[PDB]
Amino acid sequence: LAQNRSTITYRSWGRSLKYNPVVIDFEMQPIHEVLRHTSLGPLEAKRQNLR
Amino acid sequence: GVSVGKCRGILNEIKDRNKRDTMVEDLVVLVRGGASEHITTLAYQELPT
Numbered sequence: 001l002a003q004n005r006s007t008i009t010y011r012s013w014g015r016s017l018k019y020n021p022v023v024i025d026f027e028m029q030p031i032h033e034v035l036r037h038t039s040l041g042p043l044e045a046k047r048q049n050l051r
Numbered sequence: 052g053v054s055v056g057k058c059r060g061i062l063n064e065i066k067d068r069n070k071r072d073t074m075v076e077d078l079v080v081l082v083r084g085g086a087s088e089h090i091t092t093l094a095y096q097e098l099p100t
């Protein structure tokens with residue numbers, strides 16, 4: 001698609017986007033935050049150490 | 052016999068020219084529904100339809 005900016009390429013470009021969609025954007029949080037939301041229960045010491 | 056003469060001349064020329072041109076264009080699209088290949092075809096910013 002990089003070569004040309006015409007309508008001939010956007011068709012199959014959107015088709016391939018349907019085939020394989022890349023990640024457009026994502027919200028993020030530190031990795032120590034997911035430890036609080038685990039089934040293992042309280043992990044405050046390990047969470048603070050990793051923070 | 053006495054002879055005397057005097058001559059004087061002056062010329063002044065000033066020229067000024069200014070030219071300024073500006074043109075811009077903007078485009079905003081907001082489409083919701085059917086994000087398939089056809090709407091990507093229609094997402095062509097240059098052609099209007």
Ligand SMILES: *[C@@H]1O[C@H](CO)[C@@H](O)[C@H](O)[C@H]1NC(C)=O
Binds near residue numbers: 005006
């Ligand atoms: C895209 O391809 C068409 C067909 O070859 C061509 O006419 C057009 O000029 C191209 N667009 C460019 C080079 O920006």
